[PDB]
Amino acid sequence: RLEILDVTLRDGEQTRGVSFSTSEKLNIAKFLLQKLNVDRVEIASARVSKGELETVQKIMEWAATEQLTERIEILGFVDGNKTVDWIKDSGAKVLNLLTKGSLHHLEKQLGKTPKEFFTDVSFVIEYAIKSGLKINVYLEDWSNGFRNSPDYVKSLVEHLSKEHIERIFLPDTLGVLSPEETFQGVDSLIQKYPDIHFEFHGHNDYDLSVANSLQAIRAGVKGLHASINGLGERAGNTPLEALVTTIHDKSNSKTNINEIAITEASRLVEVFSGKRISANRPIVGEDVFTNLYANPILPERFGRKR
Amino acid sequence: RLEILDVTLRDGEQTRGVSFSTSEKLNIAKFLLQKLNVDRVEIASARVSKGELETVQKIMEWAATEQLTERIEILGFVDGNKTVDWIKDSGAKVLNLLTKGSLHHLEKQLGKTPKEFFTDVSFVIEYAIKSGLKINVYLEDWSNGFRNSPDYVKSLVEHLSKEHIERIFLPDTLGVLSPEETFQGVDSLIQKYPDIHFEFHGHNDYDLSVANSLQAIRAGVKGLHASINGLGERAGNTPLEALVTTIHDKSNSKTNINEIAITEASRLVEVFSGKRISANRPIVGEDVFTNLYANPILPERFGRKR
Ligand SMILES: [Zn+2]
Numbered sequence: 001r002l003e004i005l006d007v008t009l010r011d012g013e014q015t016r017g018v019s020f021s022t023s024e025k026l027n028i029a030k031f032l033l034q035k036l037n038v039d040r041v042e043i044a045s046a047r048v049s050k051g052e053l054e055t056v057q058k059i060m061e062w063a064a065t066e067q068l069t070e071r072i073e074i075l076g077f078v079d080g081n082k083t084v085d086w087i088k089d090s091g092a093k094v095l096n097l098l099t100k101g102s103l104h105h106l107e108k109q110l111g112k113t114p115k116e117f118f119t120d121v122s123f124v125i126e127y128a129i130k131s132g133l134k135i136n137v138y139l140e141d142w143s144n145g146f147r148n149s150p151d152y153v154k155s156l157v158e159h160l161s162k163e164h165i166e167r168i169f170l171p172d173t174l175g176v177l178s179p180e181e182t183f184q185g186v187d188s189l190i191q192k193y194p195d196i197h198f199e200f201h202g203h204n205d206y207d208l209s210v211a212n213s214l215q216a217i218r219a220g221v222k223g224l225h226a227s228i229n230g231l232g233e234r235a236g237n238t239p240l241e242a243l244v245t246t247i248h249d250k251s252n253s254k255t256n257i258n259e260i261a262i263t264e265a266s267r268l269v270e271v272f273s274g275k276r277i278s279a280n281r282p283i284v285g286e287d288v289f290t291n292l293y294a295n296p297i298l299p300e301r302f303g304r305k306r
Numbered sequence: 307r308l309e310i311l312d313v314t315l316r317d318g319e320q321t322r323g324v325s326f327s328t329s330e331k332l333n334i335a336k337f338l339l340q341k342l343n344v345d346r347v348e349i350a351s352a353r354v355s356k357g358e359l360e361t362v363q364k365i366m367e368w369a370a371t372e373q374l375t376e377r378i379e380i381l382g383f384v385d386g387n388k389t390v391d392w393i394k395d396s397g398a399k400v401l402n403l404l405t406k407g408s409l410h411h412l413e414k415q416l417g418k419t420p421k422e423f424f425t426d427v428s429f430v431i432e433y434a435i436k437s438g439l440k441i442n443v444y445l446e447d448w449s450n451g452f453r454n455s456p457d458y459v460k461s462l463v464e465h466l467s468k469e470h471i472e473r474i475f476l477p478d479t480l481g482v483l484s485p486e487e488t489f490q491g492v493d494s495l496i497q498k499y500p501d502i503h504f505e506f507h508g509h510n511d512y513d514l515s516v517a518n519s520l521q522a523i524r525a526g527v528k529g530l531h532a533s534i535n536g537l538g539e540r541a542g543n544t545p546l547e548a549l550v551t552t553i554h555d556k557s558n559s560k561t562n563i564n565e566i567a568i569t570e571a572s573r574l575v576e577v578f579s580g581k582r583i584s585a586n587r588p589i590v591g592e593d594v595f596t597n598l599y600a601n602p603i604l605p606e607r608f609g610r611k612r
């Protein structure tokens with residue numbers, strides 16, 4: 001019973017030539033939450049140029065109606081009051097704080113001491129809770145963090161367990177992990193803090209994202225991040241359509257995603273995003289489906305060919 | 307030091323709407339063997355409607371020139387003399403016999419006894435050797451064979467070690483294996499016959515082909531199959547561009563493939579095949595590449611951006 005977090009609207013928004021209109025975000029958000037039944041959705045980044053603020057507001061206005069405002073999440077930053085104010089205004093109720101997960105990143109971008117930066121973090125989490133939000137924390141560049149500066153990473157997670165947050169995200173930001181490493185890194189933290197909710201968020205640079213995601217599931221993770229058609233910044237995020245199918249058929253864990261809405265979700269973001277998918281795209285490609293040669297992956301299973 | 311076998315021209319040819327012209331096959335074959343430096347290439351299937359015969363003949367005529375006729379392989383069938391005659395005529399020197407690797411397949415398609423069919427196999431291998439060819443053997447549907455009728459599979463491999471063949475191919479024909487299973491199946495055969503040359507040939511139905519391919523490398527395999535842009539019949543074959551890169555960076559094994567020709571190879575088959583690749587395609591996609599955020603996968607590394 002794993003949670004699936006769709007990042008299509010935000011991380012996917014980062015893709016070159018992709019910019020969703022308010023109507024586009026509302027439509028896509030509604031479909032993912034209601035039809036695909038994705039647990040939560042990360043719709044945007046805070047302090048993006050207003051308008052983006054208006055979009056979130058409209059989506060929040062709607063979400064209120066359907067009794068599911070707690071399912072919407074907003075990428076935020078360590079900037080004191082600015083991020084939390086913007087989200088307070090947006091109407092959104094959940095954060096997803098972007099923190100540096102590698103000693104290398106912390107220094108080349110902030111130039112602060114682990115304790116120095118951990119202070120800025122505690123303040124934003126504090127102020128957010130004070131402002132009525134809930135917080136999820138990204139350990140940006142963690143895939144390089146636990147392999148190069150595992151100390152810095154262990155203290156950050158240590159410090160985070162003291163804060164009142166919902167989940168910790170372990171992203172392979174630069175998509176460099178092999179399934180082995182993904183299992184190592186995740187296992188390293190799940191064993192130390194067996195009562196925390198960690199989620200894996202891989203990137204597909206080596207076409208290992210769904211594989212990595214499977215190892216993360218073995219190492220203990222309780223949730224996973226992904227995007228429709230693997231939309232995203234480089235090679236994109238873990239491809240949602242292939243992740244879910246693989247989880248359902250190649251693992252003993254499950255998901256609440258309704259497979260039958262998978263095909264429409266794909267066509268949906270492809271059109272609105274303006275990024276074409278190849279005809280051989282796993283599970284969702286046009287040419288994908290075409291009883292001696294029976295493959296568990298059938299067209300009607302994903303709302304196609306009938 | 308693994309061997310890479312490109313199946314782009316044959317298995318890839320099977321893709322819907324794809325039919326390579328003679329000039330197209332010659333061009334693509336030349337590039338893969340000479341510039342990408344792929345060990346061998348599987349250019350076609352025997353008894354395909356003549357013309358296909360002419361193509362192979364021209365490619366063989368050329369291959370002779372460059373002193374590398376032994377690097378070209380032709381998918382063949384268990385049909386007595388027909389396949390071996392066609393390849394004898396083609397000028398090609400290597401077979402790659404398609405045999406049923408699952409008891410289920412053997413019966414629903416031939417209706418013969420393991421011993422009955424093993425006789426047809428020994429004759430074709432015999433006749434091929436008699437005709438000056440070398441033989442590689444595909445255990446079609448093996449991914450379902452070692453999991454459902456492992457007995458039938460063990461006898462077939464047993465029988466094959468008695469024949470004078472070059473290699474045994476372990477294909478995940480329907481692309482249903484998880485990396486775990488791929489490691490199990492491959493390990494099952496490599497341990498019994500430690501002196502045989504097995505190669506994995508996975509399909510990308512679950513977007514696990516390159517991951518599976520990595521496990522196959524651990525289980526003992528000495529060679530791997532793949533196609534440019536994952537061209538192929540469904541989701542296609544293991545994507546060559548991602549396989550090689552992953553092998554080089556995420557495994558201690560190596561390859562003779564020249565990474566710098568990877569980008570041109572992709573553009574090459576994309577254009578000639580008429581099958582577009584998404585802009586976020588790992589390693590080869592248009593948008594893929596775009597020093598705080600340094601990813602080992604650099605554009606100039608694959609003959610791009612300079
Ligand atoms: Zn990301």
Ligand SMILES: [Zn+2]
Pocket residue numbers: 317477479507509543
């Ligand atoms: Zn195949």
